């Protein structure tokens, strides 16, 4: 589950979206090797449940870091903070905060020196996190996402339509394409540096068989393909590639 800082971000941002956050703020320092912080405005965790959820994903994260989670439940005036180091609860505290949850993961794998030493360079880890937040942004257009890395605001995306969200992410104008129990919706831009993104139902799909086929029927083309299927095609993708101008 947790091999590097991007895995941590993934789990925290999933938790935020699970909690109906409309704003998710991510901050990384030293590529996430020093700090990973994820803050959301979702419904929070009741004080009675804060100690439980550390012990699943949070337990596995808290076991390999210096870990704080603070949360204010939508029904409570104050929040509660739990502090954990390598699985060992150091204590809890009442904290003033906004409704929502904020998790801080520091010194990832400090207890596992070889694993820390073999982590990729800061800039490599940074890009993985950037790509992951883009991925989440592309399927959550109603959600605001911000990314700070080494104190710079690297990504800021406000709530918008889906087409507006695509164009903000890829910094380009797209044409929207649609086809047909299968439904396909794609945003393409033809000049670019080819990039081929595939989402099936709501999830990002990395398959090499589909990508190279998108490169085949579409152009250096940006293709962002949202596919919906029943609990399980390529000729419909070829049909889709025939609608542009
Ligand atoms: N940002 C957040 N907002 C609200 N609740 C949160 C939260 N982060 C964690 N939680 C609560 O903590 C619980 C445990 O989170 P954790 O990620 O460890 O397990 P999970 O229930 O999400 C299953 P998994 O992550 O393995 O799919 C969640 O079920 C949720 O109740
Ligand atoms: Mg989770």
Swiss-Prot record:
Q: Which GO terms describe its cellular component?
A: mismatch repair complex
The answer to whether keyword DNA repair applies is yes
The UniProt keyword set, sorted, is:
DNA damage, DNA repair
Gene Ontology molecular functions: ATP binding; ATP hydrolysis activity; ATP-dependent DNA damage sensor activity; mismatched DNA binding
Q: Does the keyword Ribonucleoprotein apply?
A: no
One GO BP annotation of this record: mismatch repair
Q: Which family does it belong to?
A: Belongs to the DNA mismatch repair MutL/HexB family.
State the function annotated in the UniProt record.
Answer: This protein is involved in the repair of mismatches in DNA. It is required for dam-dependent methyl-directed DNA mismatch repair. May act as a 'molecular matchmaker', a protein that promotes the formation of a stable complex between two or more DNA-binding proteins in an ATP-dependent manner without itself being part of a final effector complex.
Protein's UniProt name:
DNA mismatch repair protein MutL
- Annotated organism of origin: Aquifex aeolicus (strain VF5)
